[PDB]
């Protein structure tokens, strides 16, 4: 009844979405040939939220990829569950922007965005009453950011009344792949602050930290990190796909977590995440769950919440649990560490429960806390942006394409009023 369409941008987004569609199809028992192989009928009644029954019980993921290099497409098709997509949604350019936000926003988008708008318009008209759109990308590359950026803008000006999620990985100086990361991220967030409904900030630095400490893997390939964030995305959409004793849809969570229309960046945590050796010496209870939830090392961003103040917080629980134990636990963690919470908003925790755990675990939880600690990371990247812009390094490749300086001045000013208003509300 409520619908979500999926949009993946760039190589990172496509691999993330591939892992995402794999794990959700596992959650609903659909084999890589697209046929039903589950047992419980509870899996059946809520697959319309992500699928369309094509030909006699054949289910297609309601998704649209978009990128600029065929190597991405081949990596999508090589793996399992990579042949369940409809090839009409494989909308795809040919030349490539290559970590160039200007190219991904002005040259290639100018002839690619009309077509992708057609396929998303078709996929949106195919259903009845949209709930929201989902867009996965990063903020370092150009092809994922820039085109996904203009894609978000065109969707907003077309359908401004529907929910919208964007999962964006932000680059850090510790995990610093490309060189023009600030020139990309600043411009992208400069668009995200006026277009997207809300965003979920992700970072590879925190991913590497948690696979060191909590997971203790030796070789954390990209597949595991994508497995982590996909478990997060499955956790945030679990309320729509399964009934619970306290339901919280995407719109309900957004209206509960966003106090002011510019404050829509959230740091994410997910539990339980224990090493395979430590999985035996542990218990499964809600305080055990909560203590790993509120741990600062479990956050998926490089912003220490104890360095700032929590504005709001939200907890999504999976598994048949005791609601009385839930609120009293939330009551305690707000009463004990009372300084980390904001003063002029009481009861800063929203909590929800669903009676369906993920497969393989008896009970799980996702933490979405809106703190003011994120201004650190924004200041972290804006000082690099200013550092390069002081003497105009790497500027001419954007300049000679058609972009000019006032866009950058507008980006830094928007970042500056942004961070100053976090400090104001801090």
């Amino acid at each position: 009844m409520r619908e979500i369409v999926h949009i993946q941008g760039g190589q990172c987004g496509n691999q993330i979405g591939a892992k995402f569609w794999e794990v959700v199809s596992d959650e609903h028992g659909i084999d890589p040939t697209g046929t039903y192989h589950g047992d419980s009928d509870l899996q059946l009644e809520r697959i319309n939220v992500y699928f369309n029954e094509a030909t006699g019980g054949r289910y297609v993921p309601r998704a649209i990829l978009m990128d600029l290099e065929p190597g991405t497409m081949d990596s999508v098709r090589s793996g399992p569950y990579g042949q369940i997509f409809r090839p009409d949604n494989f909308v795809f350019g040919q030349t490539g922007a290559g970590n160039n936000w200007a190219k991904g926003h002005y040259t290639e988008g100018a002839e690619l965005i009309d077509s992708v708008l057609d396929v998303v318009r078709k996929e949106a008209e195919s259903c009845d009453c949209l709930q929201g759109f989902q867009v996965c990308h990063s903020l370092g590359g150009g092809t994922g950011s820039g085109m996904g950026t203009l894609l978000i803008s065109k969707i907003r000006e077309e359908y401004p009344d529907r929910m919208m999620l964007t999962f964006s990985v932000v680059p850090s100086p510790k995990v610093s792949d490309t060189v023009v990361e600030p020139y990309n991220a600043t411009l992208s967030v400069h668009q995200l602050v006026e277009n997207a409904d809300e965003c979920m900030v992700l970072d590879n630095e925190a991913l590497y930290d948690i696979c060191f400490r909590t997971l203790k893997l030796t070789t954390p390939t990209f597949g595991d990190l994508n497995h982590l964030i996909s478990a997060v995305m499955s956790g945030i959409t679990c309320c729509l796909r399964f009934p619970g004793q306290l339901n919280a849809d995407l719109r309900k969570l957004a209206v509960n977590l966003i106090p002011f229309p510019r404050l829509h960046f959230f740091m994410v945590g997910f539990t339980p995440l224990t090493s395979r050796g430590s999985q035996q010496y542990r218990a499964l209870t809600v305080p055990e769950l909560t203590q790993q939830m509120w741990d600062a090392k479990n956050m998926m961003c490089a912003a220490d919440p104890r360095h700032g103040r929590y504005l709001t917080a939200s907890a999504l629980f999976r598994g048949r649990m005791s609601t009385k134990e839930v609120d009293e636990q939330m009551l305690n963690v707000q009463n004990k560490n009372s300084s980390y919470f904001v003063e002029w908003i009481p009861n800063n925790v929203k909590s929800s429960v669903c009676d369906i755990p993920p497969k393989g675990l008896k009970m799980s939880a996702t933490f979405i806390g809106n703190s003011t600690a994120i201004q650190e990371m924004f200041k972290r990247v804006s000082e690099q942006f200013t550092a390069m812009f002081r003497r105009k390094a790497f500027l001419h490749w954007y300049t000679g394409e058609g972009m000019d300086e006032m866009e950058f001045t507008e980006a830094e000013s928007n970042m500056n009023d942004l961070v100053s208003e976090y400090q104001q509300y801090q």
Partner: protein, 427 residues
């Protein structure tokens, strides 16, 4: 004698799922819908060999309602009363009162219209809702407004579930509560306040379940409602219907907020423990260890009280108990009521439910009183409402829907006016 029950919100349907389950197992009706005259107040004998509830489930999201449609009472409840929306108000009184209400409450009205047509001796309606949510607040208030303009004279029992002060599920629930009170101020006739924290203390202390869920909560709520309606369901030595609650519990046309309590809340082994008589539960009904609202009646002054009794009770002991309560000074009444009690008794005991955590109890007491502890409760929620309102927090969602600052300001001062009324009657 008939009365209709509607359920507005995620909490209402689950509560009704407990109530009607209790009712059919009270009247010996299997979930298929047929029996293998007392049902005539809740059930109409559809065709013959089938009974339909006089009920209307209504929500905006489909997940909980179609869960009922695939549940066990798929045939008992009949598939056209379960009105369902397409998308949730999502804890937004504006969206629930103006956006989606205008397309859904019309169908609700014209459905309950023909239900009232089918009815003959309508006593009243009763609505189930939690003012913390959006759906239970917004379209519920809008429905009550149109229901008042429809009938006006007939009693509408608002069994509301308030948010606890320290125990909270939502964030904007103060905003929702304020806006909803501004409508139920003048819409509902008789309205009963039920918190969640007192219920949590009850299941912790008496029922002694360490890890409870909402099922046991709604089980006791349904038992409260069944105890309140068994007076019209079955003949007792002293039965009282829905109409007299306006002349006995309502001294002022704007103060209609009753504190509910029940006794005895007794587990299976504790029935083996305690010898049940009436004096102890009569006391037990007044202490905060058995109330349904987290408040202190010691800080409050009682105005009017109702005491429904079920089972094997002779009136001599309830007169002796009220006499000893009146000469006892631990609970002080208001100086404007010399007699502030009203008793009632029905023969049939409240039954046990399969899997329920209650024992076979010989007699039971349902206490419905009024105090100024609500006068404290309103101040407690008004203040925390003013906190978030001082910096215009979360206001942009309601204005984006289309509301303004006027209704916030006027409801704030009106609830202020509610406080000055409470402080004036308390003296």
């Amino acid at each position: 004698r008939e009365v209709i029950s509607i359920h507005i919100g995620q909490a209402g349907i689950q509560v009704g799922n407990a109530c009607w389950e209790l009712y059919c197992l009270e009247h010996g009706i299997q979930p298929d819908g047929q029996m293998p005259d007392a049902f005539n107040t809740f059930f109409s004998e559809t065709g013959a060999g089938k009974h339909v509830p006089r009920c209307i489930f209504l929500d905006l999201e489909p997940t909980v309602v179609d869960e009922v449609r695939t549940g066990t009472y798929r045939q008992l409840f009949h598939p056209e009363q379960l009105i369902s929306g397409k998308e949730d108000a999502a804890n937004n009184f504006a969206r629930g009162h103006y956006t989606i209400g205008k397309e859904i409450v019309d169908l609700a009205l014209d459905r309950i219209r023909k239900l009232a047509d089918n009815c003959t001796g309508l006593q009243g309606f009763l609505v189930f809702n939690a003012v913390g949510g959006g759906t239970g607040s917004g379209l519920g208030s809008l429905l009550l407004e149109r229901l008042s303009v429809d009938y006006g004279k007939k009693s509408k029992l608002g069994f509301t579930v308030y948010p606890s002060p320290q125990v909270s599920t939502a964030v904007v629930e103060p905003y929702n509560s304020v806006l909803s009170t501004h409508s139920l101020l003048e819409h509902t006739d008789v309205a009963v306040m039920l918190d969640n924290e007192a219920i949590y203390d009850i299941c912790r202390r008496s029922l002694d379940i360490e890890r409870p869920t909402y099922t046991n909560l709604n089980r006791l709520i349904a038992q409260v409602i069944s105890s309140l309606t068994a007076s019209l369901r079955f003949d007792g030595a002293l039965n009282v219907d829905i109409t007299e609650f306006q002349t006995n519990l309502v001294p002022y046309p704007r103060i209609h907020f009753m504190l509910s309590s029940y006794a005895p809340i007794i587990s299976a082994e504790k029935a083996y423990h305690e010898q049940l008589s009436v004096a102890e539960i009569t006391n037990a009904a007044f202490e905060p260890a058995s109330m349904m609202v987290k408040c202190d009646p010691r800080h409050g002054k009682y105005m009017a009280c109702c005491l429904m009794y079920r089972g094997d009770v002779v009136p001599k002991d309830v007169n002796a108990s009220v006499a000893t309560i009146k000469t006892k000074r631990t609970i002080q009444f208001v100086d404007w009521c010399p007699t502030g009690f009203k008793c009632g008794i029905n023969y049939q005991p409240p039954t046990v439910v399969p899997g329920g955590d209650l024992a076979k109890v010989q007699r039971a007491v349902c206490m419905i009183s009024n105090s100024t502890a609500i006068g404290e409760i309103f101040s407690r929620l008004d203040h925390k409402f003013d906190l978030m309102y001082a910096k215009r927090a979360f206001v942009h969602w309601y204005v984006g829907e289309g509301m303004e600052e006027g209704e916030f300001s006027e409801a704030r001062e009106d609830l202020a006016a509610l406080e000055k009324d409470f402080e004036e009657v308390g003296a």
